[PDB]
Design an enzyme around this catalytic site. Structure first.
Site, PDB file in Angstrom:
ATOM      1  N   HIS A 117      -7.481   4.084 -17.525  1.00  0.00           N
ATOM      2  CA  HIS A 117      -8.908   4.360 -17.594  1.00  0.00           C
ATOM      3  C   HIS A 117      -9.376   5.160 -16.385  1.00  0.00           C
ATOM      4  CE1 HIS A 117      -9.744   1.446 -20.981  1.00  0.00           C
ATOM      5  NE2 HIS A 117      -8.676   0.879 -20.443  1.00  0.00           N
ATOM      6  N   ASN A 152     -13.311  -2.429 -25.060  1.00  0.00           N
ATOM      7  CA  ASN A 152     -12.835  -1.137 -25.584  1.00  0.00           C
ATOM      8  C   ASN A 152     -13.618  -0.830 -26.857  1.00  0.00           C
ATOM      9  OD1 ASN A 152     -10.800  -0.500 -23.657  1.00  0.00           O
ATOM     10  ND2 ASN A 152      -9.095  -1.245 -24.866  1.00  0.00           N
ATOM     11  N   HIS A 201     -14.058  -6.216 -13.632  1.00  0.00           N
ATOM     12  CA  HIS A 201     -12.887  -7.113 -13.785  1.00  0.00           C
ATOM     13  C   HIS A 201     -13.301  -8.222 -14.737  1.00  0.00           C
ATOM     14  CE1 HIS A 201      -9.383  -9.602 -12.696  1.00  0.00           C
ATOM     15  NE2 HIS A 201     -10.220 -10.582 -12.452  1.00  0.00           N
TER      16      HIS A 201
HETATM   17  C1  HDD Z   1      -2.472  -6.977 -17.088  1.00  0.00           C
HETATM   18  C2  HDD Z   1      -3.011  -5.832 -16.839  1.00  0.00           C
HETATM   19  C3  HDD Z   1      -3.990  -5.314 -17.912  1.00  0.00           C
HETATM   20  C4  HDD Z   1      -4.123  -5.555 -19.223  1.00  0.00           C
HETATM   21  C5  HDD Z   1      -3.237  -6.526 -20.073  1.00  0.00           C
HETATM   22  C6  HDD Z   1      -5.319  -4.828 -19.674  1.00  0.00           C
HETATM   23  N1  HDD Z   1      -5.719  -4.069 -18.562  1.00  0.00           N
HETATM   24 FE1  HDD Z   1      -7.588  -3.212 -18.454  1.00  0.00          FE
HETATM   25  N2  HDD Z   1      -7.197  -2.394 -16.494  1.00  0.00           N
HETATM   26  C7  HDD Z   1      -6.164  -3.045 -15.801  1.00  0.00           C
HETATM   27  C8  HDD Z   1      -5.116  -3.898 -16.100  1.00  0.00           C
HETATM   28  C9  HDD Z   1      -5.133  -4.499 -17.400  1.00  0.00           C
HETATM   29  C10 HDD Z   1      -6.338  -2.555 -14.362  1.00  0.00           C
HETATM   30  C11 HDD Z   1      -4.985  -2.059 -13.814  1.00  0.00           C
HETATM   31  O1  HDD Z   1      -6.663  -3.707 -13.404  1.00  0.00           O
HETATM   32  C12 HDD Z   1      -7.364  -1.788 -14.262  1.00  0.00           C
HETATM   33  C13 HDD Z   1      -7.380  -0.123 -13.861  1.00  0.00           C
HETATM   34  C14 HDD Z   1      -7.755  -0.414 -12.435  1.00  0.00           C
HETATM   35  C15 HDD Z   1      -8.977  -1.221 -12.513  1.00  0.00           C
HETATM   36  O2  HDD Z   1      -9.844  -1.361 -11.701  1.00  0.00           O
HETATM   37  O3  HDD Z   1      -8.648  -2.122 -13.405  1.00  0.00           O
HETATM   38  C16 HDD Z   1      -7.924  -1.638 -15.650  1.00  0.00           C
HETATM   39  C17 HDD Z   1      -9.034  -0.928 -16.221  1.00  0.00           C
HETATM   40  C18 HDD Z   1      -9.673  -1.115 -17.403  1.00  0.00           C
HETATM   41  C19 HDD Z   1     -10.967  -0.547 -17.876  1.00  0.00           C
HETATM   42  C20 HDD Z   1     -11.751   0.442 -16.981  1.00  0.00           C
HETATM   43  C21 HDD Z   1     -12.917  -0.232 -16.143  1.00  0.00           C
HETATM   44  C22 HDD Z   1     -13.592   0.970 -15.403  1.00  0.00           C
HETATM   45  O4  HDD Z   1     -14.313   1.634 -16.132  1.00  0.00           O
HETATM   46  O5  HDD Z   1     -13.336   0.958 -14.203  1.00  0.00           O
HETATM   47  C23 HDD Z   1     -11.339  -1.028 -19.066  1.00  0.00           C
HETATM   48  C24 HDD Z   1     -12.446  -0.632 -20.047  1.00  0.00           C
HETATM   49  C25 HDD Z   1     -10.155  -1.829 -19.516  1.00  0.00           C
HETATM   50  N3  HDD Z   1      -9.211  -1.872 -18.466  1.00  0.00           N
HETATM   51  C26 HDD Z   1     -10.203  -2.547 -20.693  1.00  0.00           C
HETATM   52  C27 HDD Z   1      -9.109  -3.283 -21.189  1.00  0.00           C
HETATM   53  C28 HDD Z   1      -9.159  -4.130 -22.402  1.00  0.00           C
HETATM   54  C29 HDD Z   1     -10.275  -4.178 -23.485  1.00  0.00           C
HETATM   55  C30 HDD Z   1      -7.909  -4.652 -22.439  1.00  0.00           C
HETATM   56  C31 HDD Z   1      -7.295  -5.496 -23.556  1.00  0.00           C
HETATM   57  C32 HDD Z   1      -7.917  -6.210 -24.373  1.00  0.00           C
HETATM   58  C33 HDD Z   1      -7.100  -4.397 -21.267  1.00  0.00           C
HETATM   59  N4  HDD Z   1      -8.001  -3.633 -20.528  1.00  0.00           N
HETATM   60  C34 HDD Z   1      -5.841  -4.929 -20.951  1.00  0.00           C
END
Ligand code: HDD
Ligand code: HDD
Lengths: 727, 727
Positions: free
Chosen positions: A102, A175, A366
């Site tokens: 993202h 999402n 988060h």
């Molecule tokens: C185990 C790790 C993991 C998993 C299983 C998911 N993601 Fe996540 N996502 C992250 C690890 C993460 C992250 C690595 O922690 C991030 C990018 C860095 C950030 O700040 O958060 C992130 C970013 C991030 C963002 C961007 C927020 C922004 O605008 O800064 C959104 C919308 C989502 N994710 C949504 C989802 C949804 C709806 C998921 C499943 C239902 C999902 N993610 C599963």
């Protein structure tokens, strides 16, 4: 020297203006009267500029910002030039690590308010009172591409909302589709690495159309449901304003009595659901890679504020196991025909940020950031997400003090015994930095849980099991939800799903991967499997032709809320029309066009074969927004060609191609008077065709027809007619 | 599990293969026998995979990499799952800050060798013997866009070469045009901020077509020379293999006798000079944003190694002041008609990296990295660059030990008293960490300067003047270089320049900025200024019409070396042709076509309306590479349509549009037998037209005529004819 024009035309008027009418600007200068508690609290760090001297960061006025200090005017630069070194040092360290996923996203400020008190099902303070407003900051994004990749790719989109509540920050990080690709968070790095650019050459950007993605999908049938949604037109939204949002996981609501209710979160776009078509979306990644970013920013500057209705799917605790799918499996949706979405409140995005980097790039969302009245569930994907969003900002935002970056700061009180860390802003005066303490009489103190303003206590869910690394057997069903989605789509949406799969698998170099994915589609629906196989030159085997379709989902053979278009939900306010000018425009046509568009809040862009101005037949001077090639039909919702001196543009290649592209992409076209001679370019109909509005002049009836077409978004009946057109 | 297909088709052959023939792969697996000293020295860190157990980073074998540890198979994830937390922690911190500028870039390994010893003019060891081979790592790049932006944007391109010499790393960090936009490094942050996405909304990506760029240009006339180059077709190269490279600044060569010679560095593309056309480049940023990265990598895998000739413009110390321009002004080029380029050596890029992140993303190039035999000059832009490239890697690459990241390490000895720093890899055993010391008998020791293997000593240039922040008066001339460039271009090149300015200024929202740039153009050349003004609906005033043109540059009114195309330097090897198939191709035509292309090293891609195979008239089974929409004409250099059942694709919109697009973009098209029925799609006369090859069959001179057209790159005479055409 180098100064503003005499006329003051360098600066945007501070009032709502239509797209392109004024240069865009930072939110606090564009709409200074638009406020909310969060926006106001950011005033301590906002920095102006007009009338101030140019200085170093240490506050020393600079006399000459055009040159380095040197020994002689043609001499070597001196190391004592601290003005130069500070300036270049700051430039040299501008960049911070982009988000792992993202990284490409666009954000805005707004506010939320519940329709009624939800105190019977939740003690959450932000949902307790219909007249109690909560500031929000929302970021929409893609998933795979870098922060400099294109907007209109084919992909799931992120929809993250930060609620600045009186009892803490609540981030709803969702999402635009109701399920995710995978079941357990332990596979996240595998899935993300498979969709991201391949490790040897870092290709391709912002696209799942490549071998490793389809290899992973072919070996992990749990992914098929979200892959179905990505291959449909849901994967290429028209705007962030015209897509749905979902929290995906089942969470819990906890009331003051201690009762838990399972809940799934939804956002409904009050502008309706609308998506591009693939050829359009892909070409738009090259003509305007910032299309969604721009469109959101301009809708807010125009007063077309993105509005979304928060909705909840509520399931009593005793109904946990009553569906034929597990409620905790994030690859499964809860059909609205089984559990309706209850309307909860409205969110309105009404102000753009001042500085993209400071507010958008550094924002941190988060899903672990919940408040009293909410709680988690054991969904294995959500469980591991709780570890990752705190961990990742230690490198992304440089340390544990990321809550002190202005956009992230709570607007409610925050006090504790945590100290230090890189770039610590808060200067703690407590004599104590530990508890229990007597030296400060134990403050700040813990607070017992309770109905309102109480401390957080986890719901006391019963846990019974051995320590295992095992998938629940109830999650082992991968085809019925994909099939439910397929059968709920209109015939033209089904064709676009077929085309999405066909296009993407045609870019997979290893043919056996394509075959394996076709085999998986045969477990979902044979019509779909055969339509894809035909485009890949593959023949299904006899065994594949005899695979039994998966069972219906709790008796459902379809659910119309899964389709973008089956149930009409068109809204033309905020859409845009291209108006193809000529050098002697018939002012009576333009008057009637603009008046009707204005009445329904639809914008226009006046286009011509050169920039500058053209003068209508009555002497009206019409400024040109852009050329035919400069703002292609990809960027608008419909095209209108007024009469006048049509001979001026009749033989223009770009003007003719403009209409052929709009025609191919199923957009409404309206032709008045001599403009009807363009009907020959789109080689079709002479008595007229549904989707093409034509009349001797542009009137009330002509505009009513066009606006009615625009409310249905695209001309799906024209599909059969477009694959002969050479465009 | 044992997931690969039993036929072993998951793996690409370890032999040179044409683009699209096999899945691409890591350099060392694709060309294991391709070696050099640097490539061999990286063997200590290369990690394999086949036949190894999957582990944690601490070497513990993992049993179940599909699930998190939980209490019960539907229970909560436990904090003790260290396998999950390590795997997510590493994922969560994968990203590092991208380069401030030139974040988008594509790289490869190769080697360099001088043609003859240059010991008479420089003691640089890498230039001392024709049999001395120097490994290189080269990175090509764009400038403004992020690492996830598109390749074929309109912009200057970076060309950076790391030379791993026996006396130290020498980085030659240049661009694809012989001058830069600004004169003094203190303005680098202003210029870059003006070109980068604007600060309120972070738009636009990869483009100078926006207000702040053109605002800065309009207020700083020193930028006009490089802006002319960017607006020309130089700004949109066909490939990194077909563009020139320049160091820009005047540096010094120092020989053993201590004599200094001024030098400007050049790279000549042995594949020739070639660029796209704007509509093609812009659309190609959507259809394939990784086109250049892809084309580089595939060229190397096919054996079409990118080859460049290093050349020097040499100017004696006594001629410093003999030109109309200052030799130290980076906004001025040294016309090859005044000072010829002396051929020095050849560089061949013959191996792709194994891992893009590790080798490309982490590579650090810096123009201050010179070796004995080279020295700097007082050019004020080069002087400030020397500060920035060491500084910036403290955040980009995490610390001062960035020379220890494998790709950056010298292959020659490095020993000193520097210690510690984050991520320190070298374990120093010296008893001393300071000098002078007696405890290690002062080792390692300083080395006096000398003819070979001596210590670095700066040339004793005389410095005289006061400490001033002042631009030399000799740099105050801004229009003669722009005018020389303009007059050196062909008529079609001049038109493309006019179009580039016209398109970019049409995206500038504030009309007065357009007006101000047009006024600057009127100081360069009236014809250019009038043509751009006309396209913007601007009329020049009588004062603008009488601005006297700048003087010639040292008596020159043009220099053909400044044109891409004035002097033919065509090279067809490594180009690619689209072949549009039908369901019963005349196999005789295809045999003739493919064999003629192969004899000249020209690649082909067989296209159809679906994937799979088609069978020729004689039963030959033809494998399809891609569909017509899947591999658009934008990606090829020419289009050939063989006879057969033309009725199969005669009415296919994509097949017809394929030819319209290639015809619009001036590419050679060849039609055999019944394929001549497509002449009506592109409106070709019965008699034929220069640029369209047509015959009863693909025999005789048909392929030689097509190949002659490919050697001239594009059909410039068709421009007037494309003007119209709806495509
Ligand atoms: C185990 C790790 C993991 C998993 C299983 C998911 N993601 Fe996540 N996502 C992250 C690890 C993460 C992250 C690595 O922690 C991030 C990018 C860095 C950030 O700040 O958060 C992130 C970013 C991030 C963002 C961007 C927020 C922004 O605008 O800064 C959104 C919308 C989502 N994710 C949504 C989802 C949804 C709806 C998921 C499943 C239902 C999902 N993610 C599963
Ligand atoms: C004073 C600052 C400054 C100035 C005046 C220049 N740049 Fe620079 N450039 C840098 C500050 C810098 C940089 C911040 O330090 C970068 C980015 C990250 C990096 O490692 O180096 C960089 C990267 C960088 C790259 C990328 C190397 C790679 O592929 O990693 C190239 C090709 C150029 N620049 C070339 C040039 C040329 C030919 C210049 C003018 C003649 C120019 N730069 C002026």
């Amino acid at each position: 020297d180098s100064l503003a024009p005499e006329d003051g035309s360098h600066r945007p008027a501070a009032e709502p203006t239509p797209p392109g009418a004024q240069p865009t600007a930072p939110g606090s200068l564009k709409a200074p009267d638009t406020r909310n508690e969060k926006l106001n609290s950011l005033e301590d760090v906002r920095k102006g500029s007009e009338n101030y001297a140019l200085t170093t960061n240490q506050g020393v006025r600079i006399a000459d910002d055009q040159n380095s200090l040197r020994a002689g005017s043609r001499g070597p630069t001196l190391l004592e030039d601290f003005i130069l070194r500070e300036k270049i040092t700051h430039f040299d360290h501008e960049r911070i690590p982009e988000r792992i996923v993202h990284a490409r996203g666009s954000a805005a400020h707004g506010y939320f308010q519940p329709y009624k008190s939800l105190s019977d099902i939740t003690k959450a303070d932000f949902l307790s009172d219909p007249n109690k407003i909560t500031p929000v900051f929302v970021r929409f994004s893609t998933v795979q591409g870098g922060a400099g990749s294109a907007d209109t790719v084919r992909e799931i989109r992120g929809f993250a909302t930060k609620f600045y509540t009186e009892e803490g920050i609540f981030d709803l990080v969702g999402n635009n589709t109701p399920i995710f690709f995978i079941q357990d968070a332990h596979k996240f790095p595998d899935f993300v690495h498979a969709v991201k650019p391949e490790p040897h050459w870092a290709i391709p950007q912002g696209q799942s159309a490549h071998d490793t993605f389809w290899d992973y999908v072919s070996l992990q049938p749990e992914t098929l449901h979200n892959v179905m949604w990505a291959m449909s037109d849901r994967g290429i939204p028209r705007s962030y304003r015209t897509m749905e949002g979902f929290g995906i996981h089942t969470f819990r609501l906890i009331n003051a009595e201690g009762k838990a209710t399972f809940v799934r979160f939804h956002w409904k776009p009050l502008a309706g659901k609308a998506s591009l078509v693939w050829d359009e979306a892909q070409k738009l990644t090259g003509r305007d890679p910032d299309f969604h970013r721009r469109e959101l920013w301009e809708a807010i500057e125009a007063g077309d504020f993105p509005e979304y209705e928060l909705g909840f799917q509520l399931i009593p605790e005793e109904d946990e196991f009553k569906f034929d799918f597990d409620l905790l499996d994030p690859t499964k949706l809860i059909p609205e025909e089984l559990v309706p979405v209850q309307r909860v409140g409205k969110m309105v995005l009404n102000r753009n940020p001042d500085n993209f980097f400071a507010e958008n790039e550094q924002a941190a969302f988060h899903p672990g950031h919940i408040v009293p009245g909410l709680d988690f569930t054991n969904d294995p994907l959500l469980q591991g997400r709780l570890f990752s969003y705190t961990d990742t900002q230690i490198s992304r935002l440089g340390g544990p003090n990321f809550h002190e970056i202005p956009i992230n700061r709570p607007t409610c009180p925050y006090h504790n015994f945590q100290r230090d860390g890189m770039h610590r802003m808060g200067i703690d005066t407590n004599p104590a930095n530990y508890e229990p303490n007597s030296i400060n009489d134990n403050w700040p103190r813990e607070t017992p849980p309770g109905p309102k303003r109480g401390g957080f206590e986890s719901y006391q869910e019963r846990v019974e099991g051995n320590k295992v690394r095992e998938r629940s057997p109830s999650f082992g069903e991968y085809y019925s939800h994909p099939r439910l989605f397929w059968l709920s789509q209109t015939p033209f949406e089904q064709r676009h799903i077929v085309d999405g799969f066909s296009f993407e698998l045609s870019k997979v170099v290893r043919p056996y991967i394509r075959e394996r994915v076709v085999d998986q589609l045969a477990h979902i629906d044979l019509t779909l499997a055969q339509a894809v196989a035909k485009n890949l030159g593959i023949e299904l085997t006899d065994d594949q032709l005899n695979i039994t379709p998966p069972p219906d989902v709790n008796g459902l053979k379809k659910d119309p809320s899964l389709s973008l278009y089956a149930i009409p939900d068109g809204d033309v306010k905020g859409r845009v029309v291209a108006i193809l000018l000529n050098d002697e425009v018939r002012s009576a046509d333009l008057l009637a066009i603009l008046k009707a568009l204005k009445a329904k809040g639809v914008h226009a862009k006046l286009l011509y074969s050169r920039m500058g101005e053209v003068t209508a037949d009555d002497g009206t001077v019409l400024p040109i927004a852009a050329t035919f090639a400069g703002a292609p039909s990809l960027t608008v919702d419909a095209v209108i060609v007024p009469c006048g001196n049509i001979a001026d543009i009749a033989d223009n290649g770009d003007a003719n191609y403009y209409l052929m592209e709009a025609y191919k992409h199923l957009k409404p076209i309206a032709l008045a008077g001599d403009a009807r001679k363009f009907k020959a370019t789109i080689k079709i109909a002479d008595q007229g065709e549904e989707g093409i509005v034509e009349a001797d002049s542009a009137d009330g009836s002509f505009m009513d027809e066009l606006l009615t077409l625009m409310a249905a978004h695209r001309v799906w009946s024209r599909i059969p007619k477009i694959d002969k057109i050479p465009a």
